[PDB]
C-alpha cells in the first residue's frame, strides 16, 4: 500500500512518518503509536478547514494505530522561529492571520485544541499553517451550551493563568492566550515566560509593564499593542478573536 520512506518526528507520543503511495507515488504522513489515541481519532474525523491538518483515515493493526494525515513539507513552525530573533514581521502577522482561522474554525464547532504552540503548528508546500496533533483536544459546546473545562492540559510556558489559578474556566480564552504566546515567539525568538505566575519574574515584569526589557523591545509597538489586549491575566477583560480581527496591527497590510 504505502511506502514508509523516512522519519519525520519520534517522541514518547509515537513517530511520525512519511509514506509514499507504490502506485501513485502520493506523500501522506502516518502518526504511528503503540496503544488518547480514540479520542484523537474522534475529533479528527470532525474536521475540515484549509487550516487544519487533515485525516484521511486510520488503520489498527493490533495494539498500533497508523493516522494518515496530511503532509505537511514546511515542517514545524518552531523551526521559523529563529532564536533570539524570531522571524520577519509580515511572516509573523501571515501564520498568525492562518493560526486565527483555524482557531476560529475550531471553536466554531465546540473544539478547543489546549496544546497550541509552535511545534502541533505546520506549515504545508505553500507556507500555509496548519494546526496539528489533536491528541488533547476536546469539546466544550454542545448545542449552544458551553462547558467549562478543569483539566490541567498543555505546556507551562504558553499555557494562560486562569488554568493554574482557577477551579474551572472557559475554553476559548485559554486558546486565545496560547496565540499570544505562539505570537510573541515569532516576533522576538524568545518565549516570554517559563510560567504564567506571578512568582515567575518575568510574568511579573510584564503585569508591571517593563517592556523596555526582552523580549518585548523587540516588538514593534503596533503588534505589542496586539499583545497588551491578548496577554491580559483575567480571561474575562481578555481579547476575543472576533476583537482580534478589528486590531490595528491585525489589519495593517505588510
Ligand atoms: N502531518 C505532517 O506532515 N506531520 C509532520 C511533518 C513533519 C516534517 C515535514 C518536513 C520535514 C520535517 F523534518 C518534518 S513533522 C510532522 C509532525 O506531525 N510532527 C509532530 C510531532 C508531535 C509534535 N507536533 C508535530
Redesign the pocket.
Given at each position: 500500500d504505502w511506502d514508509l520512506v523516512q522519519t519525520?518526528?519520534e517522541?514518547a507520543?509515537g513517530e511520525?512518518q512519511l509514506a509514499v503511495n507504490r502506485v501513485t507515488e502520493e506523500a501522506v504522513?502516518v502518526?504511528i503509536v503503540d496503544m488518547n489515541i480514540k479520542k484523537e481519532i474522534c475529533i479528527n474525523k470532525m474536521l475540515n478547514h484549509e487550516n487544519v491538518?487533515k485525516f484521511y483515515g486510520h488503520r489498527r493493526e493490533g495494539n498500533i494505530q497508523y493516522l494518515f494525515?496530511?503532509?505537511?513539507?514546511?515542517?514545524?513552525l518552531f523551526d521559523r522561529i529563529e532564536p533570539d530573533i524570531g522571524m520577519p514581521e509580515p511572516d509573523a502577522q501571515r501564520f498568525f492571520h492562518q493560526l486565527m482561522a483555524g482557531v476560529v474554525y475550531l471553536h466554531g464547532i465546540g473544539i478547543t485544541h489546549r496544546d497550541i504552540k509552535p511545534?502541533?503548528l505546520?506549515l504545508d508546500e505553500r507556507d500555509n499553517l496548519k494546526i496539528?496533533?489533536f491528541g488533547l483536544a476536546t469539546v466544550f459546546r454542545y448545542n449552544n451550551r458551553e462547558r467549562l473545562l478543569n483539566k490541567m492540559c498543555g505546556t507551562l510556558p504558553y499555557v494562560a493563568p486562569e488554568l493554574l489559578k482557577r477551579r474551572e474556566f472557559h475554553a476559548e480564552p485559554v486558546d486565545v492566550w496560547s496565540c499570544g504566546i505562539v505570537l510573541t515567539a515569532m516576533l522576538a525568538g524568545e518565549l516570554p515566560w517559563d510560567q504564567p505566575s506571578d512568582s515567575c519574574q518575568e510574568y511579573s515584569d510584564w503585569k508591571e509593564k517593563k517592556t523596555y526589557l526582552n523580549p518585548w523591545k523587540k516588538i514593534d509597538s503596533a503588534p505589542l499593542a496586539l499583545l497588551h489586549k491578548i496577554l491580559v491575566e483575567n480571561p474575562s477583560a481578555r481579547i476575543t478573536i472576533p476583537d482580534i480581527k478589528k486590531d490595528r496591527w491585525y489589519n495593517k497590510p505588510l
Open positions: 519525520l518526528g517522541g507520543y511520525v504522513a502518526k491538518v494525515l496530511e503532509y505537511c513539507s514546511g515542517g514545524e511545534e502541533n505546520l496539528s496533533d
